[PDB]
Structure 1
Amino acid sequence: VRHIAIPAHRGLITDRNGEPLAVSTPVTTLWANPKELMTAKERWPQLAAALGQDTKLFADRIEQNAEREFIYLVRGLTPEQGEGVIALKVPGVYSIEEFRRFYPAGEVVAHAVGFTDVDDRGREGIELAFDEWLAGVPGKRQVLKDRRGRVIKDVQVTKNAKPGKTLALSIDLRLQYLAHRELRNALLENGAKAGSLVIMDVKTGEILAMTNQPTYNPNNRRNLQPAAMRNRAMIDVFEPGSTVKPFSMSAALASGRWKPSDIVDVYPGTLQIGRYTIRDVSRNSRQLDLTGILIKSSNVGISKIAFDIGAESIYSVMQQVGLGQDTGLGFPGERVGNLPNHRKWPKAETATLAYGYGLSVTAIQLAHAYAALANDGKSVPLSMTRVDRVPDGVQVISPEVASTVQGMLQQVVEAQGGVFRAQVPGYHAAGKSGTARKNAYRSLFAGFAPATDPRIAMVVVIDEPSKAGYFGGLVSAPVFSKVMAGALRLMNVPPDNLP
């Protein structure tokens, strides 16, 4: 080794507004030439103490490595701590300017921003996904070692350590803080195991917030269990249940055979498909219109519509909105989930698909799907980075069918017997709850607002609420209301519910 690489300054990660999220902070690494340290043995106890180390263990280490010309003493200390060891004037001890990451928002954006390893290389989240952009390239400086390893002179500074590039995230730190606090509070109040909350800008494909509970302080990574490190919104796959019925309804409305005032008979709240029985959660209905099917979350109702239209039209919509499909985000450990397909769709698979059983999705897929519906049936590619020029997007559902589904979803939140807990102060809000049985449950609420001209889509996933109430509308809906209210206010969205 006659040439050494100067660690590059890792690029700044900021939120959409330039609020710092990952900052490269100067640190100092101490290394030694054992052949030189072996000539200053009386100095070892002073040095042993200065680096923390036990006196005899430190000496054993230098005696074993006595023939080597380089070893690390201690990596990434505070510059002043490094200074304090250099000030001892121990022959063979040399310093290196190094970089370590500091995460100002800490636990609030841990899962999204991720973290770097010992070597300042991206390991998790955005740190890894954008490692090439962030890392830059180290620089080579020529050194002059006589023979014993003693540095005489820096001959030629050929290549300079090119710093990493800045990266602005789509995340709004104000919305992220609001989402994190409200999800944390919901978990406490419901005695929940875990939770996820995703906020999307419907017009840009931007992830405005992505929070998971439990979270970790990335700055104090020691002791940590992977349960708090899981980026659940992108990794945890679940059956979306009744939250996918608006998509089955979109295929119904696009077929030409269905209108919202159409009536379905769901009595007695059960439907036998030979060996299999479709069962409604509440079984006190007979005739329901299409909005009623969504309000009462009738699996029987949607299965009957599904038999009429075919599972092919339902599969298509779900697939086009991104459920069980690649998000193109390239995040570490990102699960794609599953949208089963068939040549010939059997009656049982048709029903289960219509009501969200069998298929598995991520919180991120569900939010993106709701964003397409909120964005007048137009799907915009997902983004974790600030979007300056909006991509063209794909018309996945017709503007008219999307507008009708929106009105129905507004009625799911507003109408008698609906999800009144999702209601947003001064705005019309639209959405659908879900309760997936795992005897444990996953509480879901997906929606968007203002129901008039939608701006933001939101998915709230509450994993295992241990209180008497577990339905998505009891558990996840009040979280949506609070976070949606705060987000509409922060983005200065005009109210649509005035006289």
Structure 2
Amino acid sequence: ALSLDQRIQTLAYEELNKAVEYHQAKAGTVVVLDARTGEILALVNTPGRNRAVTDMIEPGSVMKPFPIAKALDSGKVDTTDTFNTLPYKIGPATVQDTHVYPTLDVRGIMQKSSNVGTSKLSAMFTPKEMYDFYHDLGVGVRMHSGFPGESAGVLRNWRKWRPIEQATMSFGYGLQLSLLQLARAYTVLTHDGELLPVSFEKQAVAPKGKRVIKASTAKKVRELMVSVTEAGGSGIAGAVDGFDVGAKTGTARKLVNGRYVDYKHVATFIGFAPAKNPRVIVAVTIDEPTANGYYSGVVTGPVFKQVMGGSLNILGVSPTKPLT
């Protein structure tokens, strides 16, 4: 009566182990969720504790879809609105992008995973509004998944923030989530704006979602996220032949390791497919890759690609375009 699919579990295990070996990494995790039920289809970690649930990270770029979603959901901005995306200062701190563009529209802000653009979208909202939104996504909240040692992550009280904290949170630093929490948050995008509960038991009753954004917003955001896995986006290494995939990739930071402090870079890739009508969310982390790549997409993209493609094949979902 587990919801896990042995074929997907085996696939995830094999692909994770391949990447951890190739990149000479310290650890890794893969989570596969049913995109419309929140059931866990696979959950694998390298040997030791259940890092998917026990270990929180500052997620980095994989958090960026959420402020964009909030901004669109509010009606304050449109996907065609253009922002100045030059580096800027908040007191002595600088917010800047990997690759600098003078302006981007909201589509471009998603496509390029712009720190500046994402932070300016967040900046249209008060600290309380942003906090309440992250809380509604489950940040800092117990999932009660049935696993012991389940991290709640960290969402600092907005009443204590600074303008720089709100900005960094929008691009995934200064809040913390486990990989399972991150996969769960993506159900807002896949399940037409409603956050699903997570479970490893086969469901008997349809889960009740909690509305966070409009279904129309979720649909638009999924469309925007496809650009991340096409030429010009950071997540091209995770593209899946025969499908459109909405995803994000980035370098996360791990500040806690079990019951001890840590400081490690973590390569991350999270996405869903088919993008228009998603069946699966696949989330991958690889801790401290030391070989054949540091850049997050190169390290975790291939795992995501193989696990997503394999999962869709296992579940019988037909490609939506011819294979290349």
**Is 2:90 the counterpart of 1:276?**
no
The residue number in structure 2 matching 1:482 is: 306
Aligned mates of 1:316, 1:472 — CA distance in 2: 29
What's the secondary structure of 1:277's corresponding residue? strand
C-alpha displacement at 1:345, in angstroms?
4.5
Aligned mates of 2:125, 2:276 — CA distance in 1: 28
Could you tell me whether the CA contact under 8 Å between 1:311 and 1:353 is conserved in 2? no
The residue number in structure 2 matching 1:76 is: none
C-alpha displacement at 1:437, in angstroms?
4.5
C-alpha displacement at 1:487, in angstroms?
0.4
- Counterpart selection for 1:315 from 128, 131, 139: 131
The residue number in structure 2 matching 1:263 is: 82
Equivalenced residue count is: 315
Any idea what the Cα deviations from partners look like across 1:166-225, whole Å, max 9, x if unmatched?
Answer: xx1111111000000000001111111110100000111100000001x2xxxxxxxxxx
Aligned mates of 1:208, 1:279 — CA distance in 2: 37
CA pair 327-489 structure 1, distance change in 2 beyond 3 A? same
Aligned mates of 1:317, 1:307 — CA distance in 2: 13
Q: RMSD of the TM alignment (CA)? A: 1.8
C-alpha displacement at 1:304, in angstroms?
1.6
Aligned mates of 1:318, 1:496 — CA distance in 2: 33
**Is 2:204 the counterpart of 1:388?**
yes
Aligned mates of 1:266, 1:323 — CA distance in 2: 27
The residue number in structure 2 matching 1:140 is: none
C-alpha displacement at 1:420, in angstroms?
1.5
Aligned AA (1:195): G
**Is 2:197 the counterpart of 1:364?**
no
Any idea what the Cα deviations from partners look like across 1:351-402, whole Å, max 9, x if unmatched?
Answer: 0111111101100000011122111112221111111321232222110110
CA pair 476-212 structure 1, distance change in 2 beyond 3 A? same
The residue number in structure 1 matching 2:17 is: 184
How does 1:396-435 map onto structure 2 within 5 Å? 396-435=212-251
How does 1:37-56 map onto structure 2 within 5 Å? none
CA pair 178-278 structure 1, distance change in 2 beyond 3 A? same
Could you tell me whether the CA contact under 8 Å between 2:69 and 2:218 is conserved in 1? yes
Aligned mates of 1:455, 1:347 — CA distance in 2: 37
Could you tell me whether the CA contact under 8 Å between 2:16 and 2:303 is conserved in 1? yes
Aligned mates of 2:133, 2:312 — CA distance in 1: 28
How does 1:157-306 map onto structure 2 within 5 Å? 168-213=1-46, 215=47, 229-267=48-86, 270-280=87-97, 282-306=98-122
C-alpha displacement at 1:433, in angstroms?
0.7
CA pair 369-287 structure 1, distance change in 2 beyond 3 A? same
The residue number in structure 2 matching 1:457 is: 281
Any idea what the Cα deviations from partners look like across 1:63-114, whole Å, max 9, x if unmatched?
Answer: xxxxxxxxxxxxxxxxxxxxxxxxxxxxxxxxxxxxxxxxxxxxxxxxxxxx
Aligned mates of 2:188, 2:74 — CA distance in 1: 19
The residue number in structure 1 matching 2:291 is: 467
Gaps of 5+ in 2: 255-262
Aligned AA (2:209): G
**Is 2:271 the counterpart of 1:447?**
yes
C-alpha displacement at 1:272, in angstroms?
1.1
C-alpha displacement at 1:432, in angstroms?
0.6
Aligned mates of 1:266, 1:468 — CA distance in 2: 31
Aligned mates of 1:431, 1:189 — CA distance in 2: 23
Aligned mates of 1:419, 1:372 — CA distance in 2: 20
C-alpha displacement at 1:297, in angstroms?
2.2
Any idea what the Cα deviations from partners look like across 1:4-28, whole Å, max 9, x if unmatched?
Answer: xxxxxxxxxxxxxxxxxxxxxxxxx
Aligned mates of 1:386, 1:437 — CA distance in 2: 33
Aligned mates of 1:498, 1:313 — CA distance in 2: 43
Could you tell me whether the CA contact under 8 Å between 2:229 and 2:245 is conserved in 1? yes
Q: Which has the higher contact order (CA 8 A, sep 6+)?
A: 2
Aligned mates of 1:469, 1:284 — CA distance in 2: 22
C-alpha displacement at 1:496, in angstroms?
2.0
What's the secondary structure of 1:284's corresponding residue? coil
What's the secondary structure of 1:444's corresponding residue? strand
Could you tell me whether the CA contact under 8 Å between 2:85 and 2:100 is conserved in 1? no
Q: TM-score, normalised by structure 2?
A: 0.92
Of residues 411-420 and 295-304 in structure 1, the stretch that sits farther from structure 2 once superposed is 411-420
Aligned mates of 2:272, 2:233 — CA distance in 1: 19
Aligned AA (1:175): I
How does 1:94-113 map onto structure 2 within 5 Å? none
Aligned mates of 2:132, 2:6 — CA distance in 1: 36
How does 1:72-111 map onto structure 2 within 5 Å? none
CA pair 437-344 structure 1, distance change in 2 beyond 3 A? closer
Q: TM-score, normalised by structure 1?
A: 0.61
Of residues 229-238 and 271-280 in structure 1, the stretch that sits farther from structure 2 once superposed is 271-280
C-alpha displacement at 1:310, in angstroms?
3.0
C-alpha displacement at 1:295, in angstroms?
2.8
